[PDB]
A paper describes a structure:
Phosphopeptide antigens are naturally processed and presented on human tumour cells by class I and class II MHC molecules. We defined a canonical motif, involving a phosphorylation at position 4 and a positively charged side chain at position 1 (R/K), accounting for ˜ 50% of the HLA-A2 phosphopeptide repertoire. For phosphopeptides with this canonical motif (hereafter referred to as canonical phosphopeptides), the phosphate moiety could act as a “phosphate surface anchor”, mediating extensive contacts to HLA-A2. To address this, we determined HLA-A2 complex structures of three canonical phosphopeptide antigens (RQApSlSISV, termed PKD2 and derived from Protein Kinase D2; RQApSIELPSMAV, termed RQA_V and derived from Lymphocyte Specific Protein 1 (LSP-1); RQIpSQDVKL, termed RQI and derived from adenosine monophosphate deaminase 2 (AMPD2)) in both phosphorylated and non-phosphorylated states.
Numbering used by the authors:
A (entry chain B): 1 to 99
B (entry chain D): 4 to 55, 57 to 137, 140 to 198
C (entry chain A): 1 to 276
D (entry chain C): 1 to 12
Amino acid sequence: IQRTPKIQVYSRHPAENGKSNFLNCYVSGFHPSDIEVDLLKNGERIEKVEHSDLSFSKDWSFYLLYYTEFTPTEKDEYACRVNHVTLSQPKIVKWDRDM
Amino acid sequence: PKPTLWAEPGSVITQGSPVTLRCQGGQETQEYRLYREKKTAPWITRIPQELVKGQFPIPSITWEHAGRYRCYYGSDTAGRSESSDPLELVVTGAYIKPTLSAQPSPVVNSGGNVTLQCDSQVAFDGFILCKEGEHPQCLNSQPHARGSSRAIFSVGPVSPSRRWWYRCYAYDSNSPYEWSLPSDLLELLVLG
Amino acid sequence: GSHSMRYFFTSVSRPGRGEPRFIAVGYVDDTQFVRFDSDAASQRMEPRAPWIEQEGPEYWDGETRKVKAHSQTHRVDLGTLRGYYNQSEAGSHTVQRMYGCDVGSDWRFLRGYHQYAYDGKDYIALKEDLRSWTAADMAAQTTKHKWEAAHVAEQLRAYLEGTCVEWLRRYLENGKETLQRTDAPKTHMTHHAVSDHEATLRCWALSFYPAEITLTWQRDGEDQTQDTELVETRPAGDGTFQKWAAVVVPSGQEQRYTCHVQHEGLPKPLTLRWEP
Amino acid sequence: RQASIELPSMAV
């Protein structure tokens, strides 16, 4: 049995175009664990992204937080780019201030 | 009045491919307003007003584009046209393909029935069987058992005179407009 | 209130790429404190919380010795099960385990558990009394028979009802400022138009702890359970959680709906309207 | 702190 990941892109504080924040890409309920997650600022990858340590829910599916510091802007377009054996090709979910 | 909502080539498109949503008010008005139910389609407002002809093109469709749409003209303080009948736009190829098979076999005597089995390796609870060879006639269904991720269909009675070619897709019921890659084609062989 | 300590181990095989990847991590409720990664350049059981930075090399040598042990057991299981289910030499597989104890309200021990999983599915679990096992499938019964005979159910009840709780209460104190404190949810609403006739009302709850929460949408009182979108409760990344609920409403009817917010760090349940 | 899980008795 395999499970396709859920993705949420968001922030650790309410967005505001002046302030800086934490950009979050939480991926959960996936099996197997082998997953590649990137955070993109306008198309291109962001060298030096953190995350938290693989762990799992009552049903043994996995979840991970890939976060980094960032400044929301009028122009800039942020996104998460995920890829997992269950997907035919990487998936790009853009950040949306309000989900 | 009222308008009509349709897609070209069709309303069920593989990802990475082109499509256009078409609207018309019988009465060639350019007050065409397109929207997606439940969540906003940012792509719509990146279309040039010249086109908003009742023409909405998609260079190459992705999951972003998937959903239920409606078309309408007027304003409320100006027009007031009833809104279009819903167009469910479906993107395929989001995930890896399921596997299709005929049980107990793909060869069937004339006028008989056969059981089709759709097996996804990815836990999913939506399965669609479409008969290829005209636009497909697709049928919906759920798994047989509880933790199955396997759907069963029943076709027939079959005839040597026509082609009986199928494919299936799997999907999450939480986003019913996002289907997987289709299984390879399955051909029934009707012993004439 | 009531507390838990929990350990989560995951080991995965890499064919041709030599040694398998291993990870492990411990929690005291919804806060991570320890972490091991077999790939991690450190090759040690690193700290994750501030209140654990507090332990002499005596700890960082035991919990690091011990995880390499666990890693080594899992190194073998991966091969056993490959045979128990006769799978090819090729292909990746996963085994996972989770254990901990629940200290009840009064800070004495309430429940223990130890569960095992192969390739995502249940494999074996230590039942309630911590002196019997439950096998998910036929293959698993061999492991049970092995284990009840080699005395694992009994040597485990000693770690759980004993030194596990003990060290938990110990972790509580060393970190009361957090694990015993709270953050109630900062709640707000947003409006988003879908058309000239419909909008979405999204009910937010942010920066809270513990994760457990409930968001309900009503319509004049009548629960709108059915036409409500909910997002998985997600992590803010400072030890707090977020979440939202959302209903599509007819334009003009916004004042008809209310969002209820039940939580532990809230003396009264809440009620929010778009236009008061 | 962690626990047992050292081998060989812990093997499945």
